[PDB]
Amino acid sequence: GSHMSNISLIVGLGNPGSEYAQTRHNAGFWFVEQLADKYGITLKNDPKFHGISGRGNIEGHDVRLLLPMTYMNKSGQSVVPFSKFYQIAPEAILIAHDELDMNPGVIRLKTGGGHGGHNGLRDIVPHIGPNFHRLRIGIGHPGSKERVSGHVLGKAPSNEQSLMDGAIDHALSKVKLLVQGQVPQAMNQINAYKPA
Structure with missing residues (x-):
């Protein structure tokens, strides 16, 4: 096991x-x-x-x-x-x-907390509870609940895609800390990311 x-x-x-x-x-x-x-x-x-x-x-x-x-x-x-x-x-x-x-280009490491309406996390937390770590990759909000489907099932414009891609690349460089159990240092260094 783990x-x-x-x-x-x-x-x-x-x-x-x-x-x-x-x-x-x-x-x-x-x-x-x-x-x-x-x-x-x-x-x-x-x-x-x-x-x-x-x-x-x-x-x-x-x-x-x-x-x-x-x-x-x-x-x-x-x-x-x-x-x-x-x-x-x-x-x-x-x-x-x-x-x-x-926002696109924002990325955070969170431990615990809720699904914040995310329909994938909503299917996981009832079973194993909330105390897993999450890499929250910013995608922005379309501005009403009725539009959320079209936004998350949309292909982001190039500027937003570039912002997300840079944040993701940054987070890849911090996985060594996470597999070593250095969650506090990884959280500090991931959450500090800025695109520009």
């Missing part, structure tokens, strides 16, 4: 299919796909856990990566059995996701 708050499971939330790959709601997939390429972790088909998953070394630590293939609002149907099967406590889990309540 050990203390050494992060050993990194989840990216999103929807499957080419038609969703470039949409804001897949920010978590963007982060975990780029992390897997950085460290040479193979993301392979994982039908048992309704996902794509990998395992590999990050900076001397054995780490698992997970992308649910459930559709966003059913993400817990992947994350919960996967984390339970590998005996990974929530304290050792990082979930990367899009954050409506932050």
Whole structure:
């Protein structure tokens, strides 16, 4: 199983299919796909856990990566059995996701707290509780609840995409701290990011 708050499971939330790959709601997939390429972790088909998953070394630590293939609002149907099967406590889990309540180019590491309306996190917290770590990747808000679907299932304009991509790249450089259990230092250094 997991050990203390050494992060050993990194989840990216999103929807499957080419038609969703470039949409804001897949920010978590963007982060975990780029992390897997950085460290040479193979993301392979994982039908048992309704996902794509990998395992590999990050900076001397054995780490698992997970992308649910459930559709966003059913993400817990992947994350919960996967984390339970590998005996990974929530304290050792990082979930990367899009954050409506932050600007594009803002990124924050949060421990605990609610789903803030996020329909993927809404499917996870009832089962494992809130005490996992989250990489909140700012995507901006479209300005009414009725518009949230169209915004998160939209492809951001190039300036916003550039801002998100820079924040994501910054966060990739801080994963070494997280897998080492240095959550306070990682939180300080991630949350300090500015695009310009």
